[PDB]
């Protein structure tokens, strides 16, 4: 029942807004309301900054709770079962647009994890099983790399004909890239060497280096060709924008 006339709107992380009563109700507390995913969460607080705890109930009987940091710099959005205690889902979002969302099963184990970085790229882990495996997906600007997660690593894979390029992610989180060619003709088989110090994969064909693929700290990929003798690199390095272009680079 808060309007433009009797409240103020406060911007929050996660592209949300809270309305805050200008006047305290009896109890000397400010009323708060915030809309998320079609439900109006309500709460009260002693501050009128827009921080506090708001709650609701979904049509499926789940209980929802939104906590806004005192700083308005971090929100936490949780979904519980009917009992208000068993966790179904939790999402933490910061002012920098970074966020982390997870889903849990009966035993409290993580069954899905979405990681969103500040730039907007994401790592998406779905169908996680008790053995630690599940489907994996990294969402970049212009394309999506699909693969699998396992207790040892995350592996994303791109295929063009006989050539498979794999982006590995350890549990520590430093990337490692390999390439394997099914083509068994020594004249056209592509091989690759990985330098961790520079995050570069060098592709060789017929014992001559042909391209450099740089996997940058900004979650982008660049490609640059060697000259026809495989000794020095040529011209400028192009930033990859489409899945097609990664496939061209593997042809």
């Amino acid at each position: 029942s808060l309007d433009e006339k009797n409240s103020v709107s406060v911007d929050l992380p996660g592209e949300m807004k809270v309305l805050v009563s200008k006047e305290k109700n009896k109890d000397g507390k400010y009323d708060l309301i915030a809309t998320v995913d079609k439900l109006e969460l309500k709460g009260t607080s002693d501050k009128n900054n827009g921080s506090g705890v708001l709650e609701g109930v979904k049509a499926d009987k789940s209980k929802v709770k939104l906590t806004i940091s005192d700083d308005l710099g971090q929100t936490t959005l949780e979904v519980f079962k009917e009992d208000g205690k068993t966790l179904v889902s939790k999402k933490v979002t910061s002012k920098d647009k970074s966020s982390t969302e997870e889903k849990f099963n009966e035993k409290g184990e993580v069954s899905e994890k979405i990681i969103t970085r500040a730039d907007g790229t994401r790592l998406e882990y779905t169908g996680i099983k008790s053995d630690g495996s599940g489907k994996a997906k990294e969402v970049l600007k212009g394309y999506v790399l699909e693969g699998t997660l396992t207790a040892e690593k995350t592996t994303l894979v791109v295929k063009e004909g006989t050539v498979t390029l794999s982006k590995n992610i350890s549990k520590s989180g430093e990337v490692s890239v390999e390439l394997n060619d099914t083509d068994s003709s020594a004249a056209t088989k592509k091989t690759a060497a990985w330098n961790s110090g520079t995050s570069t994969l060098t592709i060789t064909v017929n014992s001559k280096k042909t391209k450099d693929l740089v996997f940058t700290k900004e979650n982008t990929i660049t490609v640059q060709q060697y000259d026809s003798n495989g000794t020095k690199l040529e011209g400028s390095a192009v930033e990859i924008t489409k899945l097609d272009e990664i496939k061209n680079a593997l042809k």
Partner: antibody
Amino acid sequence: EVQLVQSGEEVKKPGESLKISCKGSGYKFSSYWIGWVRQMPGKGLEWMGIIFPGDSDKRYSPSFQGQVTISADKSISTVYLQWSSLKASDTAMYYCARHITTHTYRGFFDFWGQGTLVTVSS
Amino acid sequence: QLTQSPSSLSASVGDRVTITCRASQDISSALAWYQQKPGKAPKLLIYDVSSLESGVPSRFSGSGSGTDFTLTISSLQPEDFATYYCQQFNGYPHRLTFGGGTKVEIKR
């Protein structure tokens, strides 16, 4: 309705075996962690272990692992705590309690049995 | 890892009462509060630092940050004279630690 009913008072001698039980009601027993907590006379509370009745997954406190055995019988909604050879220092109140827990963020007991008093002495 | 400071606290019916719990390292929101009366089983009051359990009166409140947590009772009632325990959780591997307890007793 949630109710945990523990078995009755025990007076035993050292070196005897003992198994005490806890039966739950008013919730889906096989879908919640359930656990055991010790309170020695005049002292505080100490966690012993938890079990998931659905598949008998067990997490013991260090400092109790290898000292006791926790088990479950999903078909009668009962969890057990058992000693092979009691010692006088096992004299204590024992509580069974339902355990709410999620990944590495939280772990607490929201409902408690009434308690089982165990006396161990020559 | 968990130190409960007041240890024994004297107050009257209608008083404002604060109990503190200090953790040896940050524990985020993995803290719960219980009440226990002599002869009776513990009872959950607060979980996730500040969340009130169903059926516990509104005069109970919890708060805290990294390593400092507080349980507050607005206006003490006679059924609130009892012992209170904080309790923390750590996850790798599973570990639960209770505070030493704070007995809240009647002032005279």
